[PDB]
Design a protein around this ligand. Structure first.
Ligand SMILES: *[C@@H]1O[C@H](CO)[C@@H](O[C@@H]2O[C@H](CO)[C@@H](O)[C@H](O)[C@H]2NC(C)=O)[C@H](O)[C@H]1NC(C)=O
Ligand SMILES: *[C@@H]1O[C@H](CO)[C@@H](O[C@@H]2O[C@H](CO)[C@@H](O)[C@H](O)[C@H]2NC(C)=O)[C@H](O)[C@H]1NC(C)=O
Ligand SMILES: *[C@@H]1O[C@H](CO)[C@@H](O)[C@H](O)[C@H]1NC(C)=O
Ligand SMILES: *[C@@H]1O[C@H](CO)[C@@H](O)[C@H](O)[C@H]1NC(C)=O
Ligand SMILES: *[C@@H]1O[C@H](CO)[C@@H](O)[C@H](O)[C@H]1NC(C)=O
Ligand SMILES: *[C@@H]1O[C@H](CO)[C@@H](O)[C@H](O)[C@H]1NC(C)=O
Ligand SMILES: *[C@@H]1O[C@H](CO)[C@@H](O)[C@H](O)[C@H]1NC(C)=O
Lengths: 454, 49
């Protein structure tokens, strides 16, 4: 069941005396005329303070239990009252999921690591809040479903615990021989102070236009007139981002697809202009035996862009693809094609055995294996001078200790995986200084009308 | 004077107001401290400039 508070859950925001002074405050209060649960018990939330009333000439309500997990592995508070007196306690517990002669206390079964102890009809209201490691408790004491009236709640306790709280419960005395739960929100109120300094009335500056007027004037009696109280501002929904086309899509279908690629020693470099780049055609293109991005995210490619992108091409052997990578060594990544150590593109390679290999040999794909000095990052060399290994001049003729540096793959169809010709296309990304350059396409947010928002 | 945190200057005088038994100091309209309670003896004293 649910019930309606009327004007309930007002507490003194702090010390400091005070008299007749319609004083205005901003704090966490229980709004007037609220929807308070009814109970005749389970784990509730906390989320921001709690109002809590109860009624009974006997004492069935015997304290609460607080915390995040209400068990071990994290700390919690426990506030109890046997027929003797209150027992605050802070340990790590093990709480019964339903915790509750005159013999009693099946509440918990563990009291480890205690970091705080303490020992020593009717309507009993309480306000519990928890700010900056302090757990504040206000309470009242007014004797006769709730009724209707005003009664401000006076501070009781202050505990410098540090505990986190997300949940709480209640404790009841069984049979062997009614309570409510509100929540608190940040409101602004206008409290009327007596001449002795007690709060006798209040106004919930956030209810009906009358209360907002009382709040604006800082009073409990408004005289006839007309008062400006606030403002009305329509609200905008969604954010429509308009922009221009970009048609010219990445001419990627001209580099991946040409009838012939170039050999490794003299690779082809086709540089991309300023357009829109669609990688959805390559990502869903083919088997792609190897596809490793290093700098940019392969799954979010459509969200970044840079000034200029570069696309290289060559044809390397099978077991040498593992040398097209930042920081490798071998006959391929030292004399023919070296990648810098701050690479930012994406290397991709797929099998091309049935296209670039013919029977009886295919001697049209070369690779240089003799160079006097290792290659610096991103340099291309097309020299064909005789590499001279010994000490005798040879003036440019093949023979002894003077070898020709260009040799050709013997590509044939009856090879094992690791010697079949593979095609490679290495992309590189770069942002020097240009503000608006080649960039990926997005979604043209439709344009709406007769609706303000953004 | 310094009253457990309240730092100020002025003449202190015996009061005849009555706080509630959890209130430490009193304030005026326009928000200036004008009364305190002595922590040890628990009596209210006015603070005039
Ligand atoms: C690369 O070129 C080949 C043709 O040499 C393209 O293959 C065509 O694919 C389309 C769609 O499946 C077919 O309608 C054509 O008949 C194919 N061509 C031939 C000659 O059969 C291939 O699509 C091209 N790559 C890209 C990305 O466009
Ligand atoms: C703080 O301590 C002082 C003493 O150090 C307390 O003063 C006592 O007050 C009572 C009045 O109830 C007198 O009967 C005692 O004779 C006082 N003692 C001395 C040594 O003067 C004072 O009460 C304490 N503060 C509080 C709030 O109790
Ligand atoms: C309280 O909220 C519940 C949520 O469904 C609603 O059913 C009920 O009518 C509300 N009570 C009041 C008094 O508005
Ligand atoms: C009441 O409960 C507390 C909880 O630990 C306990 O310490 C105290 O002894 C109990 N009262 C009596 C009379 O045993
Ligand atoms: C809390 O209790 C557990 C189990 O008793 C123990 O392992 C742990 O050391 C205790 N915490 C501290 C700070 O000692
Ligand atoms: C309380 O829980 C939050 C979880 O978001 C955590 O970040 C915070 O540190 C906890 N409180 C303390 C005092 O550690
Ligand atoms: C409290 O207030 C009442 C009415 O406002 C007044 O008559 C009384 O003198 C004040 N002081 C008390 C009861 O000590």
């Amino acid at each position: 069941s649910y019930t309606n508070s009327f004007t309930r859950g007002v507490y003194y925001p702090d010390k400091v005396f005070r008299s007749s002074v319609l004083h205005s405050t901003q704090d966490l209060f229980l709004p007037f005329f609220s929807n308070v649960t009814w109970f005749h018990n389970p784990a509730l939330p906390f989320n921001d303070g709690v109002y809590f009333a109860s009624t009974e000439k006997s004492n069935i309500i015997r304290g609460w239990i607080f915390g995040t997990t209400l068990d071990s592995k994290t700390q919690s508070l426990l506030i109890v009252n046997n027929a003797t007196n209150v027992v605050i306690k802070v340990c790590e517990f093990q709480f019964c999921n339903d915790p509750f002669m005159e013999s009693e206390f099946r509440v918990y079964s563990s009291a480890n690591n205690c970091t705080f102890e303490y020992v020593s009809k009717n309507l009993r209201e309480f306000v519990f809040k928890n700010i900056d490691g302090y757990f504040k408790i206000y309470s009242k004491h007014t004797p006769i479903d709730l009724p209707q009236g005003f009664s401000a709640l006076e501070p009781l306790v202050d505990l410098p615990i540090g505990i986190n709280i997300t949940r709480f419960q209640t404790l009841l005395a069984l049979h062997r021989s009614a309570y409510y739960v509100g929540y608190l929100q940040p409101r602004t109120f206008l409290l009327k102070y007596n001449e002795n300094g007690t709060i006798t009335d209040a106004v919930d500056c956030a209810l009906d236009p009358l209360s907002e007027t009382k709040c604006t004037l800082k009073s409990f009696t408004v005289e006839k007139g007309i008062y400006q109280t606030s403002n009305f501002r329509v609200q905008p929904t969604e954010s429509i981002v308009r922009f221009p086309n970009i048609t010219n899509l990445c001419p990627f279908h001209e580099v991946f697809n040409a009838t012939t690629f170039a050999s490794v020693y003299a690779w082809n470099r086709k540089r991309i202009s300023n357009c829109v780049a669609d990688y959805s055609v390559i990502y869903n293109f083919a088997p792609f035996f190897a596809f490793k991005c290093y700098g940019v995210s392969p799954t979010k490619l459509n969200d970044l862009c840079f000034t200029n992108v570069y696309a290289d091409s060559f044809v390397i052997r099978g077991n040498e693809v593992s040398q097209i990578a930042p920081g490798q060594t071998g006959n391929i990544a030292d004399y023919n094609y070296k990648l810098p150590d701050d690479f930012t593109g994406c290397v991709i390679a797929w099998n091309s055995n049935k296209l670039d290999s013919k029977p009886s040999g295919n001697y049209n794909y070369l690779y240089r294996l003799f160079r006097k000095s290792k290659l610096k990052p991103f340099e291309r060399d097309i020299s064909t001078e005789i590499y001279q290994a010994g000490n005798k001049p040879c003036n440019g003729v093949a023979g002894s200790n003077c070898y020709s540096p260009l040799q050709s793959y013997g590509f044939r169809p009856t090879y094992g995986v690791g010697h079949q010709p593979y095609r490679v296309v290495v992309l590189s990304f770069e942002l020097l200084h240009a503000p608006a350059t080649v960039c990926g396409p997005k979604k043209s947010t439709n344009l709406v009308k007769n609706k303000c928002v953004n | 004077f310094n009253f457990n945190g309240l730092t100020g200057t002025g003449v202190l005088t015996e009061s005849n107001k009555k706080f509630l038994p959890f209130q430490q100091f009193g304030r005026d309209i326009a928000d200036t401290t004008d009364a305190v309670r002595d922590p040890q003896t628990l009596e209210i004293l006015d603070i005039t400039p």
